[PDB]
């Protein structure tokens, strides 16, 4: 029967569709259901509750801070200076190297997006009797750079969009955080996984004490200020990219490869002690012996400009011991021809030291020497469990 001899169709081979996209297009595949019209229905009992919207999430109010307000708080005093951006953290204590963090529903997103451009808000739940009275400030001042984040009083805050709250028989209030930028949308503050590919927050709000609290003798003077954060009337979200937040399921990291940071061969074990050449024996530094100038020599850490470095041990059950396990430390040259391991209280105090040494500083400055651990913390002076693994943390500065 008849020959279709007219020229056949043309066609250009691809291999697979489609790791993107999925907004509006029909995706053909091989369904393992028995039917070609097999789409699951949702019965009256199997009710579709949500409402799976980026907005739906960025509207729940998640806790993020808790400030203790006291009568002792001066007329001129601040309570929190937390960042006005969705990527506002809350560190949770312990214990493994990488520290876990609390994040509002407006934190988990846009952890998935690049830009946001939104308006936000903070609910300040002030647990208070009717016999507690005070006044709090709160001001979104755009253009808060690094150094300029200090040099900040409650008076210059009154220069930008700010609010004062009177509390007698009305506990909480909600401040909507304005969005002042030169840029339409706002890129990630935390960019994962990439160090220099992360731009700071557009601004921050503070909560000063406009008027100190006056508590009558039958109600306590200290009071908790719980703080919640959610996307405001128009927190927008722009473009899906690599998430900046991880699981909570398996908080492990197989240390490649095997570039585990640990003391130079021969400097083990090592306890926290003192040294006449390190702040005149007034602060703790790792020593591999009790004799003359036996200070633990540590490998040099090659860090690219615009970053900082410190150390957190893998197992706390192998760290050197004083009054507490020195799980955190900072590494910097000692001038006597090597690098020394300087134990810190916690990761924050190790970071802050890296913010000052990599910020083009010295060791004999008062700003750094107030982050060094005092020598009365040396404790029983237990040595480590050999030369346990430390991992090198990284952060922009």
């Amino acid at each position: 029967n008849p020959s279709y001899q007219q020229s056949p169709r043309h066609f250009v081979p691809t291999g697979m569709h489609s790791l993107a996209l999925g907004t509006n297009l029909v995706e053909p595949l091989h369904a393992l259901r028995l039917d070609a019209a097999g789409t699951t229905q949702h019965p009256v009992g199997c009710a579709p509750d949500e409402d799976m919207t980026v907005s739906s999430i960025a509207s729940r109010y998640g806790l993020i801070r808790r400030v203790q307000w006291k009568k002792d708080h001066a007329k001129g005093s601040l309570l929190l200076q937390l960042d006005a951006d969705p990527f506002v953290e809350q560190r949770i204590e312990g214990t493994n190297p990488i520290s876990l963090y609390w994040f509002a529903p407006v934190g988990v997103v846009s952890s998935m997006f690049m830009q946001w451009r939104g308006s936000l808000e903070y609910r300040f739940d002030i647990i208070a009797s009717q016999f507690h009275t005070g006044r709090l400030i709160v001001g979104y001042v755009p253009g808060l750079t690094a150094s300029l984040q200090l040099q900040m009083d409650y008076m210059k805050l009154k220069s930008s969009s700010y609010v004062v709250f009177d509390l007698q028989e009305s506990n909480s209030f909600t401040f909507e955080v304005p969005y002042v930028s030169y840029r339409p949308w706002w890129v990630r503050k935390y960019g994962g996984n990439y160090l220099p590919s992360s731009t700071d927050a557009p601004s921050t709000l503070f909560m000063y004490v406009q008027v100190p609290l006056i508590p009558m003798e039958a109600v306590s003077d200290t009071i908790d200020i719980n703080v919640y954060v959610r996307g405001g009337s128009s927190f927008e979200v722009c473009v899906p990219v690599q998430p900046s937040l991880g699981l909570n399921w398996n908080t492990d990291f197989i240390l490649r490869n095997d570039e585990e940071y640990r003391a130079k061969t021969g400097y083990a074990p090592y306890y926290a002690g003192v040294w006449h050449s390190f702040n005149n024996s007034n602060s703790l530094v790792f020593r591999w012996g009790s004799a003359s100038d036996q200070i633990a020599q540590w490998p040099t850490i090659s860090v690219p400009r615009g970053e900082l470095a410190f150390l957190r041990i893998k197992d706390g059950k192998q760290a050197a011991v004083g009054t507490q396990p020195w799980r955190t430390m900072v590494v910097w040259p000692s001038g006597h021809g090597y690098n020394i391991g300087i134990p810190t209280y916690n990761a924050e105090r190790a970071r802050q030291l890296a913010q000052h040494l990599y910020g083009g500083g010295s060791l004999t400055d008062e700003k750094a020497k107030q982050l060094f651990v005092p020598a009365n913390q040396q404790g029983p002076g237990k040595v480590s469990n050999g030369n346990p693994v430390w991992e090198v943390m990284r952060a922009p500065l």
Binding site: S119, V141, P142, G143, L144, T145, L148, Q151, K156, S159, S160, S161, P178, Y179, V180, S181, Y182, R183, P184, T199, D200, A201, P202, S203
Partner: protein
């Protein structure tokens, strides 16, 4: 029609440009140069705060530059290469004066971000016996380009939007420069980003296409005045003045 009638007042018209508490005149209509469309207002986009500009105060005419034009100046020698947001402030700040002191700058002191079209006059008083030519040209982002020295040339800017000024029959170059940056706003000082290149929307630059060709013992020197109007603005972003930034060098 050509009957000359110069009375006790030598006759001739004088068009004026007031416009906001300052009146500046030009006895010769200008050669305009419009590089872009008028900019729309993107305040109701980037920032939700005090959304306004300042009329009678920042929409005036302050002087930002003035210089010399002589026979010595060879063919392509820029008399000025002045940045445009920017040197409105940077001229006054290096005048051993403060930004706070002048009315056409004060909101830049307080307010964090700025957007607005620009107006510029390149007025000169040259004589009818001077045979030279200048060219005022605009570039919406000069510092961002790497090899713009290649462009930094009388030939190159003739290729684009510019105004022409000839020594004889002096003459003015009108120069309407609306806002066209990458991001719709400009930062008045250091900011969570823009840690440098503060308040820079592009630079103006006047080079020479014809030197002052003077007869024997004819008048040697000349002179230019650069004026600037900042109309159609918007200044959202209220910030204390201790956060301010005294602009960089010339």
């Amino acid at each position: 029609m050509d009957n000359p009638n110069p009375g006790p007042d030598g006759e001739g018209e004088v068009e004026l440009e007031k416009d906001s508490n300052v009146v500046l005149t030009t006895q010769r209509d200008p050669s305009t140069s419009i590089p872009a469309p008028v900019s729309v207002k993107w305040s109701r986009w980037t920032s939700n705060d005090v959304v306004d500009d300042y009329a009678t105060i920042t929409s005036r005419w302050y002087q930002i530059a003035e210089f010399v034009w002589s026979k010595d100046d060879p063919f392509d020698k820029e008399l000025a290469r002045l940045i445009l947001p920017r040197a409105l402030l940077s001229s006054i700040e290096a005048n051993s004066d403060a930004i706070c002191d002048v009315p056409n700058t004060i909101p830049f002191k307080v307010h964090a971000y700025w957007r607005g079209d620009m107006e510029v006059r390149v007025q000169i008083n040259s004589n009818k016996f001077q045979v030279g030519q200048l060219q005022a040209t605009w570039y919406y982002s000069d510092h961002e380009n790497l090899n713009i020295s290649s462009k930094r040339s009388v030939y190159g800017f003739s290729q684009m939007d510019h105004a022409l000024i000839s020594a004889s029959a002096s003459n003015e170059a009108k120069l309407v420069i609306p806002f066209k940056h990458v991001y719709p706003f400009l930062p008045t000082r250091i900011v969570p980003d823009w840690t440098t290149g503060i308040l820079d929307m592009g630079a103006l630059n006047i080079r020479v296409i014809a030197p002052l060709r003077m007869s024997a013992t004819g008048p040697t020197t000349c002179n230019v005045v650069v004026f600037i109007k900042l109309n159609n603005s918007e200044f959202t972003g209220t910030s204390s003045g201790k956060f301010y930034a005294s602009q960089i060098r010339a």
